Design a protein around this ligand. Structure first.
Ligand SMILES: Nc1nc2c(ncn2[C@@H]2O[C@H](COP(=O)(O)OP(=O)(O)NP(=O)(O)O)[C@@H](O)[C@H]2O)c(=O)[nH]1
Ligand SMILES: [Mg+2]
Length: 259
């Protein structure tokens, strides 16, 4: 049983896609925050696949208990594939989460949703360019026009933890990359190896939730703190700001290639 998780911003069209894929009629509304819990269903054309609808999230640092549900499902390691639902009309803001999803180590497939709206706006995205520079498969989809839905499933089904080798992660400023390496060494086996890069960056961000979940040793905590301090001194900038700006810097470069 292959497990696909529907991840992406609220109001991006995850449930709309879920209903088409499974045959269900789950609640779909034109405002952020409709889905409030996990909903499972089998993929109709290939029953070996189980797909999970989940509440929308803006990032992997949640706010609502609804946002937590989606995060907790991914971090429990239950997902074999991340089907990242992306609103193409607001690509830059949507990809902020995407970078974090690749970092979790669960192979990401992008449903570049709402492509029909984008075609109305007269704008276009070079799908293959966006795919190359992001290191993930991308499929232009429309839940309204019912285009590209089967193809995005097919690609997600074939981009799993058991079909994909070495994963290409978003490469940031080399100075932060040096800091990430040092945190990875410090972490060791305290996290699953697949998700190590995700946790390492979150620990650099000094994310409250991740810090509490991990319960690191006094020696790990002390070294990570020294690494942050030094990197802050090097970047002439606070840790939280370094990452936020590095993600958007990475996204801006990618969107220039694609748009
Ligand atoms: N034009 C257009 N509209 C779409 C498309 N996909 C979804 N929508 C519309 O966008 C709105 C949100 O869809 P929905 O599936 O509820 O999004 P969601 O990601 O499940 N929201 P949430 O995460 O809060 O549950 C709905 O009004 C839906 O009809 C699309 O591809 N094109
Ligand atoms: Mg939904």
């Amino acid at each position: 049983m292959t497990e696909i998780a529907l991840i992406g911003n609220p109001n991006s069209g995850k449930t709309s896609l879920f209903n088409l894929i499974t045959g269900h009629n789950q609640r779909v509304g034109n405002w952020p925050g409709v889905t409030v819990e996990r909903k499972s269903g089998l993929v109709k054309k290939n029953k070996d696949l189980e797909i999970q609808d989940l509440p929308g999230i803006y990032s992997m640092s949640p706010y609502s208990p609804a946002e937590k549900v989606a995060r907790d499902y991914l971090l429990s390691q239950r997902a074999d594939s991340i089907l990242n639902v992306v609103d193409a009309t607001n690509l830059e803001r949507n990809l902020y989460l995407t970078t974090q999803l690749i970092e979790t180590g669960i192979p990401v497939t992008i449903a570049l949703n709402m492509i029909d709206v984008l075609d109305g706006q007269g704008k276009k995205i070079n799908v293959d360019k966006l795919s190359y520079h992001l290191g993930v498969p991308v499929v232009a989809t429309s839940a309204l026009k019912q285009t590209g839905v089967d193809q995005v499933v097919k690609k997600a089904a074939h981009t799993t933890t058991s079909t994909v080798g070495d994963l290409a992660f978003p490469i940031y400023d080399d100075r932060l990359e040096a800091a990430i390496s040092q945190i990875l060494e410090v972490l060791g086996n305290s996290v699953p190896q697949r998700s190590a890069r995700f946790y390492a960056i979150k620990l650099f961000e000094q994310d409250s939730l991740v810090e509490a979940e991990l319960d690191l040793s006094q020696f790990q905590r002390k070294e990570i703190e020294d690494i942050i301090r030094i990197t802050e001194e090097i970047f002439t900038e606070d840790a939280e700001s370094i990452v936020i700006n590095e993600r958007y810097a990475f996204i801006e470069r990618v969107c220039q290639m694609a748009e």
